[PDB]
Amino acid sequence: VPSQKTYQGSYGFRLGFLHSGTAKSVTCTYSPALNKMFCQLAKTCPVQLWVDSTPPPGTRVRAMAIYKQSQHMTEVVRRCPHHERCSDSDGLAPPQHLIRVEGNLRVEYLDDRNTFRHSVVVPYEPPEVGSDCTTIHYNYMCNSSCMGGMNRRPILTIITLEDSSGNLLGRNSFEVRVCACPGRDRRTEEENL
Amino acid sequence: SVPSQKTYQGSYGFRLGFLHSGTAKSVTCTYSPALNKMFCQLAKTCPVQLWVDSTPPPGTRVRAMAIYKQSQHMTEVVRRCPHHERCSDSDGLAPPQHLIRVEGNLRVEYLDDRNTFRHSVVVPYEPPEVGSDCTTIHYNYMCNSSCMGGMNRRPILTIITLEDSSGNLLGRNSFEVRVCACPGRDRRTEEENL
Ligand SMILES: O=C(O)/C=C1\SC(=O)NC1=O
Numbered sequence: 001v002p003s004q005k006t007y008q009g010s011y012g013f014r015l016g017f018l019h020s021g022t023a024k025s026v027t028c029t030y031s032p033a034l035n036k037m038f039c040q041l042a043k044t045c046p047v048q049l050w051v052d053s054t055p056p057p058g059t060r061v062r063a064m065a066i067y068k069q070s071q072h073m074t075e076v077v078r079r080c081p082h083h084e085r086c087s088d089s090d091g092l093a094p095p096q097h098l099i100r101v102e103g104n105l106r107v108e109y110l111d112d113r114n115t116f117r118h119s120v121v122v123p124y125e126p127p128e129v130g131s132d133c134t135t136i137h138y139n140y141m142c143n144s145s146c147m148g149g150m151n152r153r154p155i156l157t158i159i160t161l162e163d164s165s166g167n168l169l170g171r172n173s174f175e176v177r178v179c180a181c182p183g184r185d186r187r188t189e190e191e192n193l
Numbered sequence: 194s195v196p197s198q199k200t201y202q203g204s205y206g207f208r209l210g211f212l213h214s215g216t217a218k219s220v221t222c223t224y225s226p227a228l229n230k231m232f233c234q235l236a237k238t239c240p241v242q243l244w245v246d247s248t249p250p251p252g253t254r255v256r257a258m259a260i261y262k263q264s265q266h267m268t269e270v271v272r273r274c275p276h277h278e279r280c281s282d283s284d285g286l287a288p289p290q291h292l293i294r295v296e297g298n299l300r301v302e303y304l305d306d307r308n309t310f311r312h313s314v315v316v317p318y319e320p321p322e323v324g325s326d327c328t329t330i331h332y333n334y335m336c337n338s339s340c341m342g343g344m345n346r347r348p349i350l351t352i353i354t355l356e357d358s359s360g361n362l363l364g365r366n367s368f369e370v371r372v373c374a375c376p377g378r379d380r381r382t383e384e385e386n387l
């Protein structure tokens with residue numbers, strides 16, 4: 001099982017999210033209380049990288065999904081047979097991969113040769129001049145409710161900062177529900193608190 | 194074997210809807226929300242609504258299949274009685290043995306499962322028509338619930354499955370059906386017992 005241990009490391013690495021609220025219109029919304037992203041199938045999911053100091057040249061940013069529950073943790077998170085077969089290809093992402101990056105031609109996809117785990121990795125870019133974080137646009141290409149895939153099992157996304165050799169510089173994670181109405185679903189889930 | 198009747202809204206938030214038709218003597222098809230049961234007349238239009246949270250892709254298909262509701266009858270294939278099988282009511286498309294037809298759709302496809310021998314009818318999924326928030330399929334039930342040598346008063350379920358162009362299951366819903374002479378009266382009577 002991949003480690004989900006939070007690690008700010010030398011560069012003070014943590015994640016940020018847009019403060020989007022729970023209006024019906026929202027495409028993507030993050031719950032601080034639940035540490036949970038609510039997002040729509042194949043829609044922009046902004047994830048912010050915050051550092052106290054610039055990581056070195058060739059630093060990379062990897063995203064990987066795991067099942068949150070102990071009893072499912074060893075099962076590779078992948079798209080359902082249906083979504084794997086859909087003609088929704090961007091010409092870059094493998095059809096089995098849940099997590100894509102949109103708007104980055106330097107994106108790289110891995111099928112791990114030992115663990116069979118899927119991940120997507122981009123070069124780390126510092127913030128645009130006058131900005132305090134780096135934004136990556138993730139797309140989740142299966143719904144949480146898909147039979148043959150996640151089938152309502154909650155997942156975590158693990159974001160790792162690595163050097164050009166793959167050495168760990170930093171790690172953070174958040175729960176993800178891919179759903180039709182993130183706004184309503186977030187508000188409903190926070191009601192139970 | 195027995196086809197699954199387990200409700201599955203799945204990726205597209207798939208639910209069934211029915212017209213709020215009431216129980217006047219003139220109604221040909223009326224649904225009881227309390228019983229989740231359709232009452233309809235032999236060979237008459239039965240609107241079944243498909244509700245989705247998101248539009249399934251092109252090539253999506255919608256399948257209807259009848260199974261007996263009671264455990265002791267579940268393994269028996271639901272088919273028309275000898276009399277109705279021999280009625281000259283053919284539309285050129287539906288096999289004469291099939292209980293469930295679709296009317297007004299030249300893209301309708303009928304299956305005799307080579308392994309289970311189960312009957313099903315499938316149509317292309319189309320997005321909701323103008324003035325509607327759902328997709329309506331017009332089903333016809335071609336044998337009465339009371340028919341001796343067929344269902345013979347045994348209650349049936351219709352299972353509606355949403356599948357992609359490759360036959361992957363996207364969603365499943367079901368409802369009980371009674372095919373009868375006076376659906377309105379029979380709905381009132383069966384709701385009285387609540
Ligand atoms: O046409 C026939 O000879 C038999 C049929 S047609 C129909 O709907 N009901 C009947 O008893």
Ligand SMILES: [Zn+2]
Nearest residue numbers: 080083142146
């Ligand atoms: Zn899926």
Ligand SMILES: [Zn+2]
Nearest residue numbers: 274277336340
């Ligand atoms: Zn009959």
